[PDB]
Design a protein around this ligand. Structure first.
Ligand SMILES: [Mg+2]
Ligand SMILES: [Mg+2]
Ligand SMILES: [Mg+2]
Ligand SMILES: [Mg+2]
Ligand SMILES: [Mg+2]
Ligand SMILES: [Mg+2]
Ligand SMILES: [Mg+2]
Ligand SMILES: [Mg+2]
Ligand SMILES: [Mg+2]
Ligand SMILES: [Mg+2]
Ligand SMILES: [Mg+2]
Ligand SMILES: [Mg+2]
Ligand SMILES: [Mg+2]
Ligand SMILES: [Mg+2]
Ligand SMILES: [Mg+2]
Ligand SMILES: [Mg+2]
Ligand SMILES: [Mg+2]
Ligand SMILES: [Mg+2]
Ligand SMILES: [Mg+2]
Ligand SMILES: [Mg+2]
Ligand SMILES: [Mg+2]
Ligand SMILES: [Mg+2]
Ligand SMILES: [Mg+2]
Ligand SMILES: [Mg+2]
Ligand SMILES: [Mg+2]
Ligand SMILES: [Mg+2]
Ligand SMILES: [Mg+2]
Ligand SMILES: [Mg+2]
Ligand SMILES: [Mg+2]
Ligand SMILES: [Mg+2]
Ligand SMILES: [Mg+2]
Ligand SMILES: [Mg+2]
Ligand SMILES: [Mg+2]
Ligand SMILES: [Mg+2]
Ligand SMILES: [Mg+2]
Ligand SMILES: [Mg+2]
Ligand SMILES: [Mg+2]
Ligand SMILES: [Mg+2]
Ligand SMILES: [Zn+2]
Lengths: 23, 214, 62, 146, 176, 37
RNA sequence: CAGGAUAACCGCUGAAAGCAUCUAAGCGGGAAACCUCUUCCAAGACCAGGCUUCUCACCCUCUAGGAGGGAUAAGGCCCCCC
RNA sequence: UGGUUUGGCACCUCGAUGUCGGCUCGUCGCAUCCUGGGGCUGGAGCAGGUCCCAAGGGUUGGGCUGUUCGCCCAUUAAAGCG
RNA sequence: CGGGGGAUAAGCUCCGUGCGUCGAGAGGGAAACAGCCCAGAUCGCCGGCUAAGGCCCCUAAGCGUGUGCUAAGUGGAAAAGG
């Protein structure tokens, strides 16, 4: 749902290089 | 523009129309009044006129009010109110010291009434707000007249400020509009208004020219 | 505090520090701050020295 | 030890800024920095060191883009379903100073230091002001080349 | 561009004055004002013509050059001659008549419909089925013409309503 | 006012224009007239 | 009721692009939707609003820097019949 | 696209998360039942089919099954979906 | 990283990896966020130099310099297709 899309999309911040725990 | 006059509620009585009809009316004693102050734009920021009413012994009133009335140039009175106008031409009509009577109105002209409601005291929900109770038998547990469910569960989890529930009622200003006027008596200076108006016997009431349709 | 003083004296903090480094003066930020609150004339003299010591063009590829 | 401000060493001053054909962001930034006193070399976070400011001719504020109708200022009274909205055009039409006051308020810390600070600002709509008896000093927004 | 290249001619019996960006023209029919867009400058030729020039060939300049030229031509021709439009009404039991500055229509509704005449225009009627409107500003003329036209809904069956001089409406026949 | 995500010049007499960010085609035949959205 | 600005839609003048086009410059119409217009609350709105009238004066103490205590005017409160 | 039915994962709660309908009482979204404004029709007109904008207000009373669901009896504009 | 079971679904499960981390790990970075980036805490110092990220104000540092694109708040949510 909306909840799921947010965290996966928020992982694409250049700060974390794209790899984060828990997708 | 919008005429006004003070008065007092007296009671109820019947009057029969020329067409052989029946219409209950209220008797209002719009006693003579005086003008003590006028409000102008460059002085205050609005347009209105100040009135006074009531007969009081000089020793009753307090010294600052007595001094204000003396400076105005009239004898002391009991109550004071004002009528808010909308232009300067209208206020130009009124002058300090002028006397107004009930004649100003004419029969067949709709007006408005202002006053205070009765004193009902603290009351239950079903009475104050017209809730609907529940079954008085077939398995009650002393919930005959209490409302019941009040809100949601954990979402959001409050009482939604503004909910309708128990509390005191009455004792506040109430107004009614476009009331017909039946007859005017000059010698007695009393009004006959069709219908019922708010207030109590021997209370305070102010009547104004109709806005909605007048 | 140093940034405020330099901006008041019409020069940026980064350029001030660059000029100090070029001139080779090793005094510390606390000393600059105390001197500025105490001796505006000395602060102005130091700022002028730094500006003189600054290179020609800050944009040069050197 | 490092210098600290004493009981009565602080001194204030009067400033006036015009708002004729200027950009709201720059005006707000300048006002905020002046309020905080960052320019003064006697800055200390714990005690205010701000300076008075006067803003004139708010109605002439210029805003770029289509923000005249696509930017909205929201607020809510508190009862359910009470969220009503207004547009910047109507806001300027009715209350010229509200936009600038809100902008400056948002441009400052929200703690009680800033709550006290916001007392330091007076904003007007017309080109005049009854505060001429205190001789305010004109000010101009400028950039330091580097 | 292509349409803005040609200078606008100026007749002898018209006065033209220029004050910076603003431009006003005085003629027998009256006078009017104008403000011009800042990207484009305007110059007057000594040979009784107006020349409009663009500083650069970008999109906005290319668009505004022709607009300014055509607008100047339209306003000069209007102040010289003016503008008029004729109207006709088709149907049975449809009438129109003139009452002073006001004009009323009878399209068959239960109640009559009246239209007020704003400033700068006049209404002329020569026949109960045909009339005309006159004015100086083409934009006002067109606005008032459209307002008058939109009084009645389109009728592709009987053609009842108001139609322009050379305007032909599609008609379809309903068998039932 | 056929509203579909995609529009086409159904017949030769259809012409395409752009308005306020939304592109639609106008034609003499109303059936041929539609807008996207 | 009436007024103001709007969504869907209907438009006038118009090049880019010799034509055409409700548009990129401009100007218009268009609803129980939005803003005033109806009733009520409301200056603890800390920018703590505005117009008026009333009194604008008697002492002591610590040490004279202010503060504290006592005695008063305008007014208010307590008790009493409702 | 929605996570609202039937489904798959066992990650928070077995020194406790008390359970379907009904009664009373709300609040919210629009994928619109009427009330409102438009357009296209294999639109004579009444009346119909479809699409677009729009969430201010209302949305009955009874018979049958505990029922949810469902069928039926009489009007109104409707007896809306969550 | 290379694989099986699965609907090429899961924050699912089962393997292999001189593989990293957490588990048994403070600081700084991404608003908050153990498993991501830099970096391994003997103690004191009102001292200097830097990685990751930043330099309009909140909040320390550039409303930096030179050459080009943007009319969409695209910047600051996604596909067939037009
Ligand atoms: Mg994965
Ligand atoms: Mg009742
Ligand atoms: Mg009962
Ligand atoms: Mg009991
Ligand atoms: Mg009981
Ligand atoms: Mg298709
Ligand atoms: Mg065209
Ligand atoms: Mg056209
Ligand atoms: Mg106050
Ligand atoms: Mg007393
Ligand atoms: Mg578990
Ligand atoms: Mg657990
Ligand atoms: Mg547990
Ligand atoms: Mg238990
Ligand atoms: Mg429970
Ligand atoms: Mg239960
Ligand atoms: Mg919809
Ligand atoms: Mg309809
Ligand atoms: Mg249809
Ligand atoms: Mg709806
Ligand atoms: Mg409503
Ligand atoms: Mg049964
Ligand atoms: Mg893998
Ligand atoms: Mg796999
Ligand atoms: Mg597991
Ligand atoms: Mg394993
Ligand atoms: Mg470790
Ligand atoms: Mg850690
Ligand atoms: Mg951390
Ligand atoms: Mg160590
Ligand atoms: Mg360094
Ligand atoms: Mg780096
Ligand atoms: Mg700083
Ligand atoms: Mg910049
Ligand atoms: Mg460039
Ligand atoms: Mg975005
Ligand atoms: Mg895409
Ligand atoms: Mg394609
Ligand atoms: Zn076509």
């Amino acid at each position: 749902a909306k909840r799921g899309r947010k965290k996966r999309d928020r992982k694409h911040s250049k700060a974390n290089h794209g790899k984060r725990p828990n997708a | 523009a919008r005429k006004g006059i003070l008065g007092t509620k007296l009671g109820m009585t019947q009057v029969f129309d020329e067409n052989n009809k029946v219409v209950p009316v209220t008797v209002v004693k719009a006693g003579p009044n005086v003008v003590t102050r006028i409000r102008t734009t460059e002085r205050d920021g609005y347009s209105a006129v100040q009135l006074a009413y009531g007969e009081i012994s000089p020793r009753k009133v307090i010294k600052p009010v007595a001094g204000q009335f003396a400076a105005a140039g009239v004898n002391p009175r009991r109550h004071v109110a004002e009528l808010r106008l909308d232009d300067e031409a209208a206020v130009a009509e009124y002058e300090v010291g002028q006397e107004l009577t009930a004649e100003i109105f004419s029969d067949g002209a709709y007006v408005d009434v202002t006053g205070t409601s009765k004193g009902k005291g603290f009351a239950g929900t079903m009475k104050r707000h017209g809730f609907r109770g529940q079954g008085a038998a077939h398995g009650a547990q002393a919930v005959h007249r209490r409302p019941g469910s009040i809100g949601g569960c954990a979402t959001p989890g409050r009482v939604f400020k503004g909910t309708r529930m128990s509390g005191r009622m009455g004792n506040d200003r109430v107004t009614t509009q476009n009331l017909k006027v039946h007859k005017v008596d000059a010698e007695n200076g009393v009004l006959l208004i069709k219908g019922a108006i708010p207030g109590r016997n021997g209370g305070l009431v102010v009547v104004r020219s109709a806005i909605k349709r007048g | 505090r140093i940034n405020a003083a330099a901006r008041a004296n019409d020069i940026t903090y980064n350029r001030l520090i660059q000029g100090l480094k070029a001139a080779g003066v090793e005094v510390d930020r606390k000393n600059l701050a105390e001197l500025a609150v105490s001796d505006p004339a000395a602060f102005t003299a130091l700022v002028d020295v730094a500006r003189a010591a600054l290179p020609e063009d800050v944009n040069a590829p050197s | 030890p490092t210098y600290t401000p004493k009981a009565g060493d602080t001194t204030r001053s009067w400033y006036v800024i015009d708002a004729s054909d200027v950009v709201l962001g720059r005006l707000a930034s300048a006002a905020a920095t002046l309020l905080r006193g960052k320019h003064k070399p006697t800055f200390t976070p714990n005690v205010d060191g701000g300076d008075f400011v006067i803003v004139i001719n708010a109605d002439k504020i210029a805003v770029s883009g289509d923000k005249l109708t696509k930017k909205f200022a929201y607020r809510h009274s508190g009862y359910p379903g009470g969220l009503r909205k207004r547009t910047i055009g109507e806001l300027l039409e009715k209350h010229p100073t509200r936009v600038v006051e809100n902008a400056i308020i948002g441009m400052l810390p929200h703690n009680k230091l800033g709550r006290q600070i916001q007392k330091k600002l007076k904003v007007y709509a017309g080109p005049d002001h009854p505060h001429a008896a205190q001789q305010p000093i004109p000010f101009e927004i400028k950039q330091v080349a580097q | 561009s292509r349409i803005g290249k040609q200078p606008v001619p100026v007749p002898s019996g018209v006065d033209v004055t220029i004050n910076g960006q603003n431009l006003s023209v005085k003629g027998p029919k009256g006078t009017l004002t104008l403000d011009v867009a800042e990207p484009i400058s305007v110059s007057r030729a000594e040979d009784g013509a107006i020349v409009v020039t663009r500083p650069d060939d970008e999109r906005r300049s290319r668009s505004l050059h022709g607009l300014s030229r055509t607008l100047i031509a339209n306003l000069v021709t209007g102040v010289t001659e003016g503008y008029t439009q004729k109207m006709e009404i088709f149907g049975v039991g449809y009438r129109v008549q003139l009452k002073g500055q006001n004009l009323e229509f009878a399209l068959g509704y239960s109640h009559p419909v009246l239209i007020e005449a704003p400033e700068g225009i006049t209404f002329a009627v020569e026949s109960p089925t045909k009339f005309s409107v006159s004015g100086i500003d083409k934009q006002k003329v067109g606005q008032i013409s459209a307002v008058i036209r939109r009084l009645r809904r389109p009728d592709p069956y009987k053609g009842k309503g108001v139609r322009y001089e050379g305007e032909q409406i599609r008609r379809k026949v309903g068998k039932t | 006012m056929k509203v579909n995500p995609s529009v086409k010049p159904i017949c030769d007499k259809c012409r395409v224009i752009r308005r306020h960010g939304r592109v639609m085609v106008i034609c003499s035949d109303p059936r041929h007239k539609q807008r996207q959205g």
